[PDB]
Structure formats: structure tokens, C-alpha cells
Design a protein around this ligand. Structure first.
Ligand code: NAG
Ligand code: NAG
Lengths: 216, 217, 123
């Protein structure tokens, strides 16, 4: 199976430079073109360039010439995208993709989220949201992930085991701290007594918090 | 560069109906030596990475449902979903993969039309942990409603509060086709302690009557 | 080339080959000794390789396939995908010198539902 594993999220100051990696498995990257594409928040897709890992030969969208550099290391089946002199306008999700001779993009990595900002990293406070002080054969718990930076965080309920009934909401806002929330709805039974915990990772601040939800 | 233009910007159809969207290139994508048109279609489900549906205008990618059908030639292209499914909600992109730079269309957002649904509402007071760190957020969840457009009035003692309140919508659900929404009134710990009580009102087209959740203390 | 379509693979002596023995799954792999010989295999949805290619002492490019009947999936006997194209690999230009004029292309191929990425030299 053709698979592309991309490196983790990046915070990077303006003017600075960052290097992303794309690691392929289940095939040899020599036999493909590896492309990079970006997607700015709520926006469309845009080709950056590609490389022939058999060649080293690269092609770019002239507009990215000078700011993007694609390379590849065939001994580790990995391609790289180096970006330099970044600005806020480059804040985006960066994807790598395979093509054959056709250049149609047939397989895609999960993407790498790159935030360009002067703001300092901040870990979030994580607040268990319990219902007020009973049961209409349905009950909803909440998790409030507050005041962090940058995007992203990952939230799960009891380590992913609990998934249906889950609504996790896109982060806001602010000045300049993000706030995110998640609701989980379960059958009024198994809560309480069977305990529900939301699990939040803010990778940027190396934060990993499990907050059990408890009756007030 | 070749300009790609997609139509329409958004789409809404109910499950089972036929879906149609189009793509115009500023010039021919026809490889003469090949008699192939180098146009591709991609699907991007919310929070996921794009995935290839069709390439060479009409050749369907391996592992892609037969309901997905790309057609046309020259400078006019269409992607059609013969009978749409709940899971097909996505942004759809065309791309010419003919010449560098391989340019993409601006995308068509496909949504699923379904029956009206009123939200399930839940109000949550600030946790203890947050009140120690000196703050107070009241959180209101409005889940599994349709259509997207909903309004939340946060009432503190019958008097509307419109500052400190933040709102956030999910994308459309890939199974029941609803939306959910989070509303979070955040005040000062003692602004929260100075007052009582706290209410959020969910006014939807689905009723004359507001769904209302509240609490005291 | 000399082209030559070949017979079932069978066992080749652990002392006749000069260099490596490549087999094509269609992906180019390199087979070895005991646990370089026994290239027995049916077509790779079910079985290991479509065919192989090596080089005896005399400097002759030896090939072997499976019993001859994408049409390559049904019945292919090694490196050749079409009469005009063969699967590229390190020892391609040794094993197939007549093909140095061939243009190389990157391609995709499905075998029993698993995707292979190959480079092909054509014409
Ligand atoms: C090499 O191959 C040629 C032709 O296939 C054959 O006649 C010869 O016997 C082979 N020599 C050895 C040492 O295998
Ligand atoms: C490649 O095709 C051309 C055109 O028919 C011809 O030279 C020959 O068939 C092939 N060349 C070689 C070296 O096999």
C-alpha cells in the first residue's frame, strides 16, 4: 500500500525557515514524483513544485522560487520541503503527494500544519464540563480547552474508545489565544459510574492532559 | 498559467439525487499525441486531506465508487455523482495536470440537504478548576440541528449578553447530515459571581418557540 | 535483444550466474541462495514473481517466466510489460543493452489489488 507519512505541526517566526518531511512506505520514491501543495485556512489548493527522487530534478511554481526548496533522500524514502523567509501569509497546511508520469496527484499525506507567528507558545487549561445539579434518558458531557497557541490540539474521549455521540468544535478566537470545545453524548446510563475522560494533546507545549468528568 | 474555474461555488442535494459540477480551463487540456485530457478531480472531506477521484478527465481512480463520474473534453469538464450519499459531503477540486504549474480550480462545496431538525441543547456552568484559576466560562452546546443557520441569545437575568460570547460550528455530519454548534460566554470570575442567573436561548426556524436551557447558583 | 520468450523458471545452479538474479513482482527484487536459485512461481497475485532475468558465465542474459497463455497481469514472463516496454532496474542496461535508447517513464500497476510503483523504459 502506497502511504505518505508527514512530519508534525510547526510554529515558526516570521523571517524564519522550516523544513518539513514526507516519508513514504510500501513503495520506493524513486519510482514516483513527489509533489508539495499548500492550503491556506478556509481556502483552496495550490501547487508548490515537485521532485524526481531518481533525478534530484525539481520544478517549481515561479512564485515560490526563492522561498521553497524540495529535496529527497532515497536511502530513507523521504522527501523534504524547506521553506524560508516565512510570513503570516504562508500559514497553511502543507501536503505531499505522489504522481506517476501523469502528474495527477494519486496519493496524499495527512498534511502538516504550519503556523507563522511572533506569538509565544502557550499550553491550554483543560476544563471538565459537567451538567448542572436529572436525566431525560440522555446526558451530554463537555470539555473546554482554553487559552492556547498555536493550532493544533487533539481531543479524544476515553482514548478514542468513545467516538459516536462526539462533537468536537473548531477552535476560536481571540487575542491571541485559541479556545476549543468538545461535547460527548451518552445514554444517561454508564454515566456516572462508568467514568468519562477527555484526552487533550497540545503538541507545541508538549502537553498531554486527561481530565475525568465528575458530578458537581 | 492555465486558469481553472469551477461552478458552482456550492451545492446542496438530498441523498439519492444526482449531483453535477463543472470545470472550465482557460485553454485545451487535450494531449494531441495521447488523445487524453489532463484534467483531474479531487475530493476533500472536512479535516481530511484531498483524495483523487478521476484523472484523464474520465478515468476513475482505483477504489473509487462507480457513482463518481467525470466527463467532458477540450475546455469544458464536469464531475457527476449519480446518486449522492451522506458521506459524499466535501469540497471538490478540479486540477489541470497538463502543464506546470498544475493549477487547481477554486472548489465546489457539496452539502447534503436533509429534513429539518431542532437542536439538542445543553448548558454547562464554569468548572471548579477554572474558577480557581480566576475565570468563568458558561458553555452551551447546540447539537444535531438542521439547517446550518441558528441563533443563540445568551440571557443573563433577562438581559441579553452579546459580548464575551464566542461561537463555533462543526462541518456537516457525514452520517446524519446535521450541524452542531458551541456557544461559550466567558466572563470575569466575579462578574460571574456578581450575577445570577444564566440562560442561553436557541432560536431556530424549526420553531416559533426558543429551546431554552438555564441554571442558578 | 535477443527478445526470446522463455520457459518455466525452475532451479538454476548455485554456481552459474554472474551477478544478481532479478525477479519482477512486477516490482524488481533480488532473489538468493537456498533459504541463487529456485525461481519457481505462478503469476504474483498468487505466487512470487512473473519471471526473472540473470547472467550466466558466458555473459549471456538468461531469462525465465511462467507458462505463457492489463494483459501483463494475466500472462507476463518477467521484465517485459509490452513488446516495446520493460521494467527498469539497476542491471537493466547490462541485461538488456539494446534498450539504452528507451525513454524512461514512471508508472503505476495493480496486482491482486495491491499497488506497485515502477519505472518503465519504452520507445
Ligand atoms: C550462457 O548462455 C548461453 C546462451 O543462453 C549458453 O549457450 C551457454 O551454455 C551459457 N553458459 C553458461 C556457462 O551458463
Ligand atoms: C524501438 O522502436 C523503434 C520503432 O519501431 C525501433 O528502433 C525498434 O523497434 C525499437 N528499438 C530497439 C533498439 O529495440
Amino acid at each position: 500500500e502506497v502511504q505518505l507519512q508527514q512530519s508534525g505541526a510547526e510554529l515558526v517566526k516570521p523571517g524564519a525557515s522550516v523544513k518539513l518531511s514526507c516519508t513514504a512506505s510500501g513503495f520506493n520514491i524513486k519510482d514516483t514524483y513527489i509533489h508539495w501543495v499548500n492550503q491556506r485556512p478556509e481556502q483552496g489548493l495550490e501547487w508548490i513544485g515537485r521532485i524526481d527522487p531518481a533525478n534530484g530534478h525539481t520544478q517549481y511554481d515561479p512564485k515560490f522560487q526563492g522561498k521553497a526548496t524540495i529535496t529527497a533522500d532515497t536511502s530513507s524514502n523521504t522527501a523534504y520541503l524547506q521553506l524560508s523567509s516565512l510570513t503570516s501569509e504562508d500559514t497553511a497546511v502543507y501536503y505531499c503527494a505522489t504522481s506517476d508520469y501523469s502528474y495527477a496527484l494519486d496519493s496524499w499525506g495527512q498534511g502538516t500544519s504550519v503556523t507563522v507567528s511572533s506569538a509565544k507558545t502557550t499550553a491550554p487549561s483543560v476544563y471538565p464540563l459537567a451538567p448542572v445539579c436529572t436525566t431525560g434518558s440522555s446526558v451530554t458531557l463537555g470539555c473546554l480547552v482554553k487559552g492556547y497557541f498555536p493550532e493544533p490540539v487533539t481531543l479524544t474521549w476515553n482514548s478514542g474508545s468513545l467516538s459516536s455521540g462526539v462533537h468536537t468544535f473548531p477552535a476560536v478566537l481571540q487575542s491571541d489565544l485559541y479556545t476549543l470545545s468538545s461535547s460527548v453524548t451518552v445514554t444517561s446510563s454508564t454515566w456516572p459510574s462508568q467514568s468519562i475522560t477527555c484526552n487533550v494533546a497540545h503538541p507545541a507545549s508538549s502537553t498531554k492532559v486527561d481530565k475525568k468528568i465528575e458530578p458537581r | 498559467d492555465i486558469v481553472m474555474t469551477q461552478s458552482p461555488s456550492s451545492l446542496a442535494m438530498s441523498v439519492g439525487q444526482k449531483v453535477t459540477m463543472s470545470c472550465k480551463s482557460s485553454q485545451s487540456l487535450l494531449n494531441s499525441n495521447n488523445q487524453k485530457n489532463y484534467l483531474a478531480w479531487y475530493q476533500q472531506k472536512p479535516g481530511q486531506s484531498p483524495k483523487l477521484l478521476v484523472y484523464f478527465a474520465s478515468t476513475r481512480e482505483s477504489g473509487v465508487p462507480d457513482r463518481f463520474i467525470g466527463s467532458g473534453s477540450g475546455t469544458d469538464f464536469t464531475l457527476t455523482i449519480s446518486s449522492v450519499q451522506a458521506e459524499d459531503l466535501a469540497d471538490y477540486f478540479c486540477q489541470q495536470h497538463y502543464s506546470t504549474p498544475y493549477t487547481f480550480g477554486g472548489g465546489t462545496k457539496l452539502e447534503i440537504r436533509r429534513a429539518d431538525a431542532a437542536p439538542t441543547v445543553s448548558i454547562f456552568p464554569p468548572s471548579s478548576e477554572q474558577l480557581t484559576s480566576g475565570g468563568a466560562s458558561v458553555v452551551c452546546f447546540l447539537n444535531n440541528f438542521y439547517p446550518k443557520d441558528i441563533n443563540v441569545k445568551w440571557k443573563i437575568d433577562g438581559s441579553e449578553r452579546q459580548n464575551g460570547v464566542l461561537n463555533s460550528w462543526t462541518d456537516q455530519d457525514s452520517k446524519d447530515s446535521t450541524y452542531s454548534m458551541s456557544s461559550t460566554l466567558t466572563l470575569t470570575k466575579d462578574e460571574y459571581e456578581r450575577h445570577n442567573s444564566y440562560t442561553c436561548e436557541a432560536t431556530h426556524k424549526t420553531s416559533t418557540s426558543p429551546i431554552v436551557k438555564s441554571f442558578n447558583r | 535483444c535477443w527478445h526470446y520468450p522463455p520457459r518455466q523458471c525452475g532451479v538454476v545452479s548455485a554456481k552459474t550466474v554472474c551477478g544478481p538474479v532479478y525477479c519482477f513482482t512486477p516490482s524488481p527484487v533480488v532473489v538468493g541462495t537456498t533459504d541463487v536459485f529456485l525461481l519457481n512461481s505462478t503469476r504474483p497475485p498468487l505466487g512470487s514473481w512473473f519471471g526473472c532475468t540473470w547472467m550466466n558465465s558466458s555473459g549471456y542474459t538468461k531469462t525465465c517466466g511462467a507458462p505463457p497463455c492489463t494483459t501483463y497481469l494475466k500472462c507476463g514472463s518477467g521484465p517485459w510489460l509490452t513488446p516495446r516496454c520493460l521494467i527498469d532496474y539497476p542491471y537493466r542496461l547490462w541485461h538488456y543493452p539494446c534498450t539504452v535508447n528507451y525513454t524512461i517513464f514512471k508508472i503505476r500497476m495493480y496486482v491482486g489489488g495491491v499497488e506497485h510503483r515502477l519505472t518503465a523504459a519504452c520507445n
